[PDB]
């Protein structure tokens, strides 16, 4: 059983202002391919999959995904098919400086240039991801990527190269998706490019320091952002009409129990997974709670880091799924942390003091259905941080292959479902007074996603794998063309 | 300019239950003079005095106070005069025990027998504090006092005797006075008794660590309690018609300015203060910002004194006479805390953002006009420890030496007005669901003021000092006769 | 110190709806110089400035000032470069009709329209004050200007003749700006021209009531405009395009003490301050309690004048710097009014019952910052008044010459910091659903400020008096180029 | 039709305190009778029905009424049925001071004392209204009674020969029963005794003032008060367990239209039907918007009066009937007062702004049904007076003689209904925090109603004219007698 919205409690487009925007992202690695065509150097994921296969679920990689480096058109078909008005898509640095640095691929940039265009030529607006989790390999072998300073230089660089050639079409960029995630897996857990975490713990390379290398990689990321936006807004905004921010991971949190020792590991959860990159764009500087449990394993910034940092994002993006209760862990002589997010003491709990999970299963053994989350994340944007423009950067669910409760790949009623429960959260929101922006489905088409490979379809439009990789509107795609009145 | 209650908003007797009990408090050293008679044995305070004695602002000392070791029936008299309900005194633990351990001194028992005595025939209930920063001297030159674990079997040993002596009539006890005010002041900044601080601070005997002293004292009053609070459970509470409590000294917060920051600063504050010795009782651990933030130098709990000191309290009391704004430090690394009270992180400021004192100067320098503050404290006792019964154990404010502004001792009209508005704000908070069951004003009458000696009066009732310390009625006083109907 | 809003705190464009209208403001006398060149009368301020000069705290006039009648394109230059929207300026009526009736003069007339198809060009619209305290010296010498009945049909004709010259581009007009300020100042205290007095007190021409003429002058501001007004609406508005209002200065009150009597005082400061004027355009009557306190000194309006009143503005400017705490004055015996503001019964405190400022000073000495009382009157026109169109006409700080906390007159970043909290402030009432349709600030440019002549300066923009009255833009202009941007 | 309530709405005894208190009133004037017995001076009521008799609307007066001086013991037999614990009643002045002053009459004292045992012996507390409009005719011969300062000691000697006679058993008093009522209809309208008005008014002696002598009576009766509170204090209350106060007519208000107006004209109402008698023992001074509107008509108090006056009340009665709405009028040139009730400038309307009355009839044509205004007024009285201690010492309504809807005296359903709905606006006022203490029916036995006669039965109890006079149990009477659970 899964309940559905009854037919009245069904968003309508006008329940939303005429300049909010409805929209569906991807990323390079995930859909593009063309893993080494044209020029294209090989990436921290094209790395990964090639030296540590066994690391994807089902066994595939992303060298060719989608395949849309050569059928984006028909990405901008699907976009045009169910009205969408933007488009959040990645570009691959690899594509575009094969060595991370130096001499730009002229065919990379032509590619952006293209689908940028086709967008444009079809009524669609671009918004750019710069970076997602997408590092050029000779800069991993080089000095080891974001965990080593030179980082923050090379992706200046990287930046500046979309601002020059893209700018004068693109006019939204986010630096970074997802640092977050990006920290605790690649560098805690060790499940995602590189691939790495402490000796002793299972990864591809366990050579490295779960409690050590989230944090650089993090501090790098936030200062390549600082720099960024700095260079962003003295030499790339000459008409004041670009706007520039991060895209951050986030998950609700509830109290597990009824209980001031949950109230406060609730917003320890919040603080290391919202705030430990949100922190330092409003204020350059990250929690107190982070500071106070992570000590001389979270750098300092200096003075003129922290105010670089502090007001960098014009907008920012959500990126929402699902949300968890938080259970209190004490401070004491027999614990000792061992992965980056024990830090938080507070353990992510998926079932609550009275025995129930949060929210129904959705497909995908970590989406928990719960709306509500979103709607309150969204009113502490608002009341905490000054309710900056928000976007809904990614949201949906999967289809997990071979589920017998999804034998049709098209009939995805359940997504469906989940996405008019969390576009009905977001007017909630906005009728509370939260500033959102935009509302942009993760994802636009079926793609590679990271360690479970293409067994979860996260799309909105069917990728036929045996079918020439064809585009195949699914029944929530439809409904978006319907509710954006094609 | 000092703005009294109009007359409509001035408490009457009504306005509690029938079973709410008014009474005021003193301590032992602070009145009862005769410092070496009867056997009684020197305490810390008697050596500190008499050893430091420029340590005391007006060059005086505790030898003879009111000399309530010979006069006690004249402060009988005097809570009968006001018609008081209760009158909550401390026992000297060096009158008692003069070596700390040991043969009981007889004359130092019947001193209480005949105050208990007194009480009772005068229809007053005796709430009897056990230990009043009060500790014998033989035990701090012995062992270091509360520096060292033996302080726990010995002030153990002292509760029993007092439950021996005094339990048949005595159902109301208070193990401990004020631990916060006492370990900051007598081991952070020294200025107290034994008069500790780190190596380069100003204090009498700067030979200790700010940082760790403390802790260290504050950990053992901790243990001394859950000991003695589980032998009078077991062994002195047959009828079950007893009930024993702390009492902590508490300042209201308020944030410095409207920012998250100062809003985790004020909630680091009120730990600081109120729940490093009352989180303890309610869980039997210190609250996770103080471990957090103070790691190794604040002791670990064994899981049996957890479970000891969790629920140990049937009663609180709660000490309040002010309130601060909460201001945020940051973690930083060109910031390391020197005294134990920087481990907060949070300043407590006498001025707002706005530039404004909290609340009216009442004569001593630290004591500005808030009750707010205190309805505020009352109601986090509610919602979140549980509601469990608060006695208003001291709240009063000084008339200071001297000071042009109050000539007239006895005119304290002032006094009057703090005493009217807090105990409507403990109206307050009753109307509001908080389960306050008493309104203990200090003091029952003037006396030594420790490192402000006499000149800081604090009573109900003068004490004349050119008159052979005679006790005389201040408006306040006669106030009081007047409302409990006398 | 003086504490500023958290960068996350600070106002954005796009907190306000696109319609909402962002703009400075001045007035004729404080800018324009010129006071005598191309046929232009003398005003009041002319005159008593040439006759009374010692009545200017710093020794100088409005002959000069700006320079605005020969710089005007300067103001709009910086404006422009600030992007701001709208720019209310008023006529200076002596300078367009010299002898305040008859012959017009074109030159007075050819300035006007420079200045505002100047505007247009570029992209600016005007807001236009008819009269601002501005009254020709030979009206006043005639009849005693604003004193006789005279007036109200020799404003009528000047007002038309307004309409006539300006209404094919001028499409927002405010008849009067601050009639309280106005009539206190100029025939109460007699400091503002023409300087009337009660005799015995100290003003120019201690020759008048302070009793009386204030309401004498007041009465026959609101009949001239009702007059005005019906005449715009019967001949002045064929396109139906064009909105007329009045311009309130206003204070915010608190009650000075918890008390019903200061609840009471509050509400009779209010209409003493705001209810005077504003109450009559209203409902054709000043409030009751004034009329009941007052008596035969308030002159009664006749049934034709009480509806030609009701109802009278399209649009309604408030001009809002600061608050007072309000006190309950007794009706006595012992007591009798000797000023026009003594028959509120409520005296205007800067500091509360808690011995507190309102709010912090600001430079000059009436300028508490106190944004909250400018959304609680916003919220009164709400409630109380039919929520009718309200812009913020006035709200600024100054800067003292020669105050050694503010020694550059550029870096105005506390002024700058009162805005943002202001603009906040406005945004709150909106939020709470208060009609609010623009915010100019006080003032566009440095000018006379009266009594205090220049010594006080108001400005966006510096005035460079030792550098030919150039225009330079200050931090909180810059902040604005920004904000708007520009 | 006449909607009861229904049956699981009606009032049990449990929903108040057990220490709350039931009770019913009279007056002597009312009951008594034996108008001339045993020494008895005359009244202004005896005299007024003997020299105007045509001024009582069915013929009769209260030369034998209820004939309670004789039959005194089944009044207290009534109360004793019905289960009441309080019976409230007056003193007649004229009965045991024939003259005003001087000799006492031992017979009238007599008559007081056995009431009063017998109340005892029946275990039923009298609380005893002084002065209830029943003032010795010699001492309105003498000097024109309340209209005269001599009024303010002779009153005082009566008062203290009560305390004297009957304070060793009476315990709680008031000195006066509604004043407001009194002064407005004994010298405004002059339709109540002595029957003054202005001349060309229509009342039995037209040679009065009806814009002055209200005040002049209703300022001595505050006077007389103040005095006898002192007295009382200072010398009839030894054992502090007696309560003085004041017993005042009140109705509720509602604004007549939603308008600010009436927002206004209903507090004016308020303060001029409550306040005016009410707010000199609150704060010593009538309200402020009546000395705004009757300036010299009402006499100022001097600093010592003042402070007699405020906070000389332990207790308060507020007597209940009906509510207003209340209706703004303007100041104006073609308006003057001409009762004393014109000076609110508020009419009171009995029909609202949509047309309808505000609440059913009830019997006689005065008391309209509305047990919200009696919520609301408690709820002014603990907001904004201080929440002292309040006795509903009047409520209930009149069956009109020969009504054909009540043509069974004892068949009082309407009655039951109106008190049992009056009781649960009393119910609502206590759960929101009024400090209630007690009800009171008006009135025990239907008794001479004023200007009405016996034509306007009060009762519980019914008086059978035509049989004796005999005491005989209406329906609401049974009532009562279950609920108190007899
Ligand atoms: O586990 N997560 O919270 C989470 C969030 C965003 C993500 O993108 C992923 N992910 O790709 O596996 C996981
Ligand atoms: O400074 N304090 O907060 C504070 C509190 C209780 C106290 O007893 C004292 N004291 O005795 O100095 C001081
Ligand atoms: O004192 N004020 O409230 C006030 C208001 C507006 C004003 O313009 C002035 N002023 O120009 O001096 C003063
Ligand atoms: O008319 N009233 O409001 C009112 C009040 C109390 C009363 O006692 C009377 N009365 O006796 O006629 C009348
Ligand atoms: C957002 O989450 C989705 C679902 O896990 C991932 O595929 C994206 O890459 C991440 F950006
Ligand atoms: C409570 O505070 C008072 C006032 O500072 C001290 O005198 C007491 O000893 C402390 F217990
Ligand atoms: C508004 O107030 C400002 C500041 O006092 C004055 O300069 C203006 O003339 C008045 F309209
Ligand atoms: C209370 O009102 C009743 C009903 O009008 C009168 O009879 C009483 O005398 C008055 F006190």
Same mark, same amino acid.
């Given at each position: 059983?899964?309940?559905?919205?009854?037919?009245?409690?069904?968003? @309508?487009? $006008?329940?939303?202002?005429?300049?909010?925007?409805?929209?569906?992202?991807?990323?390079? *690695?995930?859909?593009?391919? #063309?893993?080494?065509?044209?020029?294209?150097?090989?990436?921290?994921?094209?790395?990964?999959?090639?030296?540590?296969?066994?690391?994807?679920?089902?066994?595939? +990689?992303?060298?060719?995904?989608?395949?849309?480096?050569?059928?984006?058109?028909?990405?901008?078909?699907?976009?045009?098919?169910?009205?969408?008005?933007?488009?959040?898509?990645?570009?691959?640095?690899?594509?575009?400086?094969?060595?991370?640095?130096?001499?730009?691929?002229?065919? &990379?940039?032509?590619?952006?240039? +293209?689908?940028?265009?086709?967008?444009?030529?079809?009524?669609?607006?671009?918004?750019?991801?710069?970076?997602?989790?997408?590092?050029?390999?000779?800069?991993?072998?080089?000095?080891?990527?974001?965990?080593?300073?030179?980082?923050?230089? $090379?992706?200046?660089?990287?930046?500046?190269?979309?601002?020059?050639?893209?700018?004068?079409?693109?006019?939204?960029?986010?630096?970074?998706?997802?640092?977050?995630?990006?920290?605790?897996?690649?560098?805690?857990?060790?499940?995602?490019?590189?691939?790495?975490?402490?000796?002793?713990?299972?990864?591809?390379?366990?050579?490295?320091?779960?409690? =050590?290398?989230?944090?650089?990689?993090?501090?790098?990321?936030?200062?390549?952002?600082?720099?960024?936006?700095?260079?962003?807004?003295?030499?790339?905004?000459?008409?004041?009409?670009?706007?520039?921010?991060?895209?951050?991971?986030?998950?609700?949190?509830?109290?597990?129990?009824?209980?001031?020792?949950?109230?406060?590991? =609730?917003?320890?959860?919040?603080?290391?997974?919202?705030?430990?990159?949100?922190?330092?764009?409003?204020? &350059? $500087?990250?929690?107190?709670?982070?500071?106070?449990?992570?000590?001389?394993?979270?750098?300092?910034?200096?003075?003129?880091?922290?105010?670089?940092?502090?007001?960098?994002?014009?907008?920012?993006?959500?990126?929402?799924?699902?949300?968890?209760?938080?259970?209190?862990?004490?401070?004491?002589?027999? *614990?000792?942390?061992?992965?980056?997010?024990?830090? #938080?003491?507070?353990?992510?709990?998926?079932?609550?003091?009275?025995?129930?999970?949060?929210?129904?299963?959705?497909?995908?053994?970590?989406?928990?259905?719960?709306?509500?989350?979103?709607?309150?994340?969204?009113?502490?944007? @608002?009341?905490?941080?000054?309710?900056?423009?928000?976007?809904?950067?990614?949201?949906?669910?999967?289809?997990?292959?071979?589920?017998?409760?999804?034998?049709?790949?098209?009939?995805?009623?359940?997504?469906?479902?989940?996405?008019?429960?969390?576009?009905?959260?977001? @007017?909630?929101?906005?009728?509370?007074?939260?500033?959102?922006?935009?509302?942009?489905?993760?994802?636009?088409?079926?793609?590679?996603?990271? &360690?479970?490979?293409?067994?979860?379809?996260?799309?909105?439009?069917?990728?036929?794998?045996?079918?020439?990789?064809?585009?195949?509107?699914?029944?929530?795609? @439809?409904?978006?063309?319907?509710?954006?009145?094609?």
């Amino acid at each position: 059983v899964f309940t559905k919205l009854k037919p009245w409690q069904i968003p @309508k487009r $006008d329940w939303f202002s005429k300049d909010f925007l409805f929209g569906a992202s991807t990323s390079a *690695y995930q859909i593009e391919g #063309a893993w080494n065509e044209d020029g294209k150097g090989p990436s921290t994921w094209d790395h990964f999959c090639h030296t540590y296969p066994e690391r994807i679920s089902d066994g595939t +990689n992303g060298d060719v995904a989608a395949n849309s480096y050569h059928m984006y058109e028909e990405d901008v078909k699907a976009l045009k098919d169910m009205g969408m008005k933007v488009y959040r898509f990645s570009i691959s640095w690899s594509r575009i400086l094969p060595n991370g640095t130096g001499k730009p691929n002229q065919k &990379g940039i032509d590619y952006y240039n +293209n689908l940028i265009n086709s967008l444009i030529r079809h009524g669609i607006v671009p918004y750019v991801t710069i970076w997602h989790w997408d590092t050029p390999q000779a800069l991993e072998d080089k000095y080891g990527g974001f965990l080593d300073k030179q980082i923050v230089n $090379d992706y200046k660089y990287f930046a500046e190269l979309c601002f020059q050639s893209f700018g004068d079409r693109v006019k939204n960029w986010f630096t970074f998706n997802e640092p977050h995630t990006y920290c605790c897996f690649s560098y805690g857990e060790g499940i995602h490019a590189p691939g790495r975490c402490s000796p002793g713990l299972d990864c591809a390379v366990p050579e490295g320091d779960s409690l =050590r290398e989230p944090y650089t990689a993090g501090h790098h990321i936030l200062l390549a952002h600082a720099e960024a936006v700095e260079l962003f807004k003295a030499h790339y905004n000459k008409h004041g009409d670009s706007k520039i921010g991060m895209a951050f991971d986030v998950m609700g949190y509830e109290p597990y129990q009824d209980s001031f020792l949950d109230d406060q590991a =609730r917003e320890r959860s919040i603080d290391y997974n919202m705030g430990w990159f949100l922190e330092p764009v409003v204020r &350059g $500087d990250y929690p107190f709670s982070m500071r106070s449990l992570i000590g001389d394993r979270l750098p300092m910034f200096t003075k003129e880091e922290q105010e670089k940092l502090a007001s960098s994002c014009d907008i920012m993006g959500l990126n929402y799924y699902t949300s968890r209760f938080s259970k209190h862990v004490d401070i004491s002589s027999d *614990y000792t942390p061992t992965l980056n997010t024990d830090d #938080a003491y507070a353990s992510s709990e998926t079932t609550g003091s009275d025995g129930n999970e949060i929210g129904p299963i959705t497909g995908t053994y970590w989406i928990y259905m719960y709306p509500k989350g979103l709607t309150d994340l969204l009113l502490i944007m @608002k009341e905490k941080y000054g309710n900056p423009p928000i976007f809904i950067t990614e949201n949906g669910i999967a289809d997990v292959e071979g589920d017998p409760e999804m034998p049709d790949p098209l009939d995805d009623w359940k997504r469906l479902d989940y996405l008019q429960r969390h576009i009905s959260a977001v @007017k909630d929101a906005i009728d509370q007074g939260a500033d959102v922006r935009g509302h942009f489905t993760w994802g636009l088409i079926d793609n590679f996603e990271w &360690g479970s490979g293409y067994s979860s379809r996260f799309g909105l439009v069917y990728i036929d794998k045996e079918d020439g990789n064809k585009r195949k509107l699914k029944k929530s795609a @439809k409904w978006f063309a319907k509710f954006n009145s094609v």
